[PDB]
């Protein structure tokens, strides 16, 4: 029953069966590398990948720095037997952890079932293996045997934390996206992981740790395994499909390459950035590709290169693609079976869903970028278990994701140098000197991934404006934990394809990795001259670096940006002079006690309101914290919110384009009562679909263009609060170390207590801030986006009402007996709006509970 049914040690002797030196497809001539077959169809090679790609042979940092927020290099990693033993055991342990969830059991079983198609022949009656979907397995005597293979885990290339799914291409076939599939090579390391900031789960866990949390490498591996799943079933989305961004404005990223394949694979909100028109186009495309597989199987008459029979190989692919087969042996694609398989491969197998099964903390969107690299070691059971990961049951690490908190669980995480420098990729934002008073420009560098995601309009498409033909026939059209259990129940575990004998290939298998779209470097260091302080200036103003003297808080953004010993606070002037005052030893602890009170009072303030649609609270200090709406005061912010609504938060106003909706053309059947009536009912049903489509489109637009903005403001509000805590800490601490080491011995001061209290107050603040910003997001949706939709939908309703009433009149002869009933039906149905229910379009119990 375990996925890995054998203990593997790197120094174990070879047997040519599941422990062996192997050769994989290679462009030149690769040396055999020791590998381990940890499960049918799945191998692990504990080596750095200097093999799959001829250019990437050097393990040193590149000439030009890679355009990613976090990268890590060490040419010595994974060069020793002990490291390779630890790698192997870590990967093996992560497979069992994935397998130990229902979802992973399914995914891993789909992967094993998803053998690359036998489309190696050019004759359309012959099945034949494709060479590059195989390996050569060296025997203990020095001979070799060739074997088919679905998946290989290998060590990373130069950039140790660049994890990706690679695959050998074909001169004619695009195997990863034509339904065929190909053997997948995942660059991965269990020995490092990413660190990220999270502040959302603070309402459920008010005791959430300060600082960075570590990504569970099981989530990371599951992510790459999802990719490998898509690619094995040959339904990956071409990487030339990218969600392109606007990069011109001062507040926008300089560049961002995120593929549709990645959005799909993440799941959650990210997957919904892709509109319905593109979504359905994909599904239809892959459906036809599966149909081609069924058809080539139907005309297959022979098989070469194996003793395995034709009926056996056909069945292997009937099973992989869940084809139907009639009693004469003719294979076909069933629309319903395809839809379920495609839905499972792309919507059930997602990172988001894996995070639910693991019950770990994780970035909620790709836009919450990784911020650090950590060294880890998950092999020792005292560090990490198959069932609990880092969050070990019956310990203090069990709750609040404490095991993933790199500060609380610091022995498990060593923070490493990010080889992407802080301002390697940046924009230079300058408040024009005259604005500040002439006096110099106030220029700061802003890291690329601290800027805003502004999706290009071209990412969003629709055929709302197209008309359609209503017919008597016309066809009338969520992922829950229960649904996943229902899909789970269709799985037969135990039943896998055999490892069959194939004829030996060449000693060297010639292979080239799938041709990838070349990507341009972003422009870097672009300079902007601005007529205001930005959020970014207000945030930078709250920072400090290493220094010898006492930091002082100031309420002037300007002063703080000009003086390394001065830090901007949005707290009250009273707070400013209290923290800044010289404080004698005998009053130290009461002074600390008061500052914590004050810090808490200021950060937990909430104003209630009855004057803004769908916004019942306001956090007033958000105004001066980030200069929201370019109004430097709390009073300015509160009033500006009530006046203009949620828009003042936005860095940019989204385009929301709903065109005149296409008109329904009704077909007349002038000799048939039933058909005429069905046509009228169909028109009504299609109308109901139209509201749904319009709403769904607007939700997609809102999530990608508006909600992402509020998300970043939320992240930055947390950074601001942390900045305030750190500054207050540094000052309190400076004041302490001014005392005699006799005063200090009496005042047994523990800065850890201070940090813990301030973190708690930051969590409580973030609870309010998150509720507030949630309300703002939904309120903007409800009051500034959806109404454009409903107006267009009401125009359409009115137009449709006229058409249907005319249709009934023109067919009153045919509709003898029913004219008046059909009028009521049409009039009643098209008189009142279809209410928008957010829960129909998103399953975030967070944004849902706001609605």
């Amino acid at each position: 029953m375990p996925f890995v049914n054998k203990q593997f040690n790197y120094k174990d002797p070879v047997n040519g069966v599941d422990i062996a030196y192997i050769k994989i497809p290679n462009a030149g001539q690769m040396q055999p590398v020791k590998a381990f077959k940890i499960h049918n169809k799945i191998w692990v090679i504990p080596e750095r990948d200097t093999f799959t790609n001829p250019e990437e042979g050097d393990l040193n940092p590149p000439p030009e720095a890679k355009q990613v927020p976090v990268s890590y290099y060490d040419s010595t990693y994974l060069s020793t037997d002990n490291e390779k033993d630890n790698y192997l055991k870590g990967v093996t342990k992560l497979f069992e952890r994935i397998y130990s969830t229902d979802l992973g059991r399914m995914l891993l079983t789909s992967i094993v079932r998803g053998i690359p198609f036998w489309g190696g022949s050019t004759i359309d009656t012959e099945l034949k293996v494709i060479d590059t979907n195989c390996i050569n397995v060296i025997q203990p005597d020095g001979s070799y045997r060739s074997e088919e293979l679905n998946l290989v885990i290998i060590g990373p290339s130069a950039d140790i934390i660049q994890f990706e799914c690679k695959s050998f291409g074909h001169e004619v076939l695009n195997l990863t996206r034509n339904g065929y599939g190909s053997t997948q090579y995942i660059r991965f390391s269990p020995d490092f992981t990413f660190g990220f900031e999270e502040s959302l789960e603070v309402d459920t866990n008010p005791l959430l740790g300060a600082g960075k949390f570590a990504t569970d490498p099981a989530v990371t591996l599951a992510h790459q395994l999802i990719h490998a799943g898509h690619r094995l079933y040959g339904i990956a989305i071409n990487p030339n499909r990218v969600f392109k961004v606007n990069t011109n404005a001062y507040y926008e990223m300089s560049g961002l390459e995120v593929s549709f394949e990645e959005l799909r694979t993440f799941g959650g909100h990210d997957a919904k950035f892709i509109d319905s028109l593109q979504e359905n186009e994909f599904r239809l495309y892959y459906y036809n590709k599966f149909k081609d597989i069924a058809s080539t199987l139907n005309k297959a008459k022979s098989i070469v290169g194996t003793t395995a029979s034709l009926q056996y190989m056909k069945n292997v692919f009937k099973e992989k693609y869940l084809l139907s087969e009639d009693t004469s042996g003719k294979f076909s694609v069933d629309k319903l079976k395809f839809d379920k398989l495609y839905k499972m491969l792309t919507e059930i197998y997602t990172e988001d869903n894996f995070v639910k099964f693991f019950k770990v903390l994780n970035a909620k969107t790709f836009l919450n970028f990784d911020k650090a690299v950590f060294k880890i070691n998950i092999v020792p059971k005292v560090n990490y278990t198959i069932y609990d990961g880092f969050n070990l049951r019956n310990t203090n690490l069990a709750a609040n994701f404490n095991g993933q908190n790199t500060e609380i669980n610091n022995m498990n995480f060593t923070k490493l140098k990010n080889f992407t420098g802080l301002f390697e990729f940046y924009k230079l934002l300058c408040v024009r000197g005259i604005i500040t008073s002439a006096l110099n420009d106030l220029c700061i560098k802003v890291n690329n991934w601290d800027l805003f995601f502004s999706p290009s309009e071209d990412n969003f498409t629709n055929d709302l404006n197209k008309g359609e033909e209503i017919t008597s026939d016309t066809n009338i059209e969520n992922i829950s934990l229960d649904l996943i259990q229902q899909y789970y129940l269709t799985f037969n575990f135990d039943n896998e394809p055999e490892n069959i004998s194939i004829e030996n290939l060449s000693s060297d298998i010639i292979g080239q990795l799938e041709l990838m779209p070349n990507i341009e470097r972003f422009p870097n260091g672009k300079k902007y001259e601005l007529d205001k302080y930005t959020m970014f200036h207000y945030l930078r103003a709250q920072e400090f670096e290493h220094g010898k003297s006492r930091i002082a808080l100031t309420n002037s953004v300007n002063e703080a940006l000009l003086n390394p010993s001065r830090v901007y606070t949005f707290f009250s002037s009273d707070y400013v002079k209290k923290v800044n005052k010289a404080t004698e030893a005998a009053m130290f602890l009461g002074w600390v006690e008061q500052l914590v009170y004050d810090f808490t009072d200021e950060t937990s303030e909430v104003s209630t309101t009855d004057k803004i649609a769908d916004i019942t609270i306001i956090i007033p200090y958000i105004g001066p914290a980030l200069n929201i709406g370019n109004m430097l005061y709390k009073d300015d912010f509160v009033g500006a919110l009530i006046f203009s609504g949620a828009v003042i938060l936005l860095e940019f106003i989204p385009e929301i384009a709903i065109p005149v909706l296409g008109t329904f053309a009704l077909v007349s059947y002038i000799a048939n009562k039933v058909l005429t009536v069905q046509t009228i009912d169909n028109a009504l049903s299609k109308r109901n679909e139209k509201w749904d489509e319009v709403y769904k489109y607007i939700v997609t637009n809102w999530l990608a263009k508006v909600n992402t903005q509020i998300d970043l403001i939320r992240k930055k509000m947390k950074e601001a609060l942390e900045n305030q805590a750190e500054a207050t800490k540094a000052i309190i601490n400076y004041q302490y170390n001014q005392y005699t080491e006799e005063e200090k011995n009496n005042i047994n001061f523990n800065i850890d207590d201070l940090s813990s209290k301030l973190n708690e107050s930051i969590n409580k603040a973030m609870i309010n801030i998150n509720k507030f910003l949630n309300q703002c997001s939904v309120s903007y949706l409800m009051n500034s986006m959806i109404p454009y939709g409903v107006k267009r939908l009401e125009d359409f309703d009115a137009s449709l009402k006229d058409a249907l009433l005319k249709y009934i009149y023109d067919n009153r002869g045919t509709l003898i007996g029913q004219v008046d009933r059909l009028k009521d039906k049409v009039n009643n149905t098209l008189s009142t709006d279809i209410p928008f229910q957010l829960s129909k379009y998103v399953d975030n119990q967070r944004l849902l509970s706001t609605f």
Partner: nanobody, 123 residues
Framework: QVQLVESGGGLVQPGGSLRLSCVVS????????MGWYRQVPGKPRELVAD???????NYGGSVKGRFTISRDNAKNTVYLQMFGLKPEDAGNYVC??????????????????WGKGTLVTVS
């Protein structure tokens, strides 16, 4: 459930001596891979010594011959004789009952048993 109850922990002086013992409920004791782990606040458990079903022993790197682990199956009890105690030996000494589960151990999963521990403090 199965219970692990540790005794013998206390305040010891550098160079001093301690004998820890742990008794285990249930009937599976002879099956277990018994171990002693040390844990300090804010830090993971770390293996001090363990002993297999057959009585084979393994010691953490810092033991260096100073401790002896032993088991008495008849008393469902495991022992740790400690000599030459050092400040770095300080901590909560937690007994652990583990067993094989094929390729893995129960600990790796980990559904193995842990006591509340007996404190060791070094003067």
């Amino acid at each position: 459930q199965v219970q692990l109850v540790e005794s013998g922990g206390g305040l010891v002086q550098p160079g001093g001596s301690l004998r820890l013992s742990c008794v285990v409920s249930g009937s599976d004791f002879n099956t277990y891979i018994m171990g002693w782990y040390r844990q300090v606040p804010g830090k993971p458990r770390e293996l001090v010594a363990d002993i297999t079903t057959e009585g084979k022993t393994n010691y953490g790197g810092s033991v260096k011959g100073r401790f002896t682990i032993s088991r008495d199956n008849a008393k469902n009890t495991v022992y740790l004789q400690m000599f030459g105690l050092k400040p770095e030996d300080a901590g909560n000494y937690v007994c652990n009952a583990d067993w094989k589960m094929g390729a893995w151990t129960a600990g790796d999963y980990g559904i193995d048993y842990w006591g509340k521990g007996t404190l060791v403090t070094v003067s």
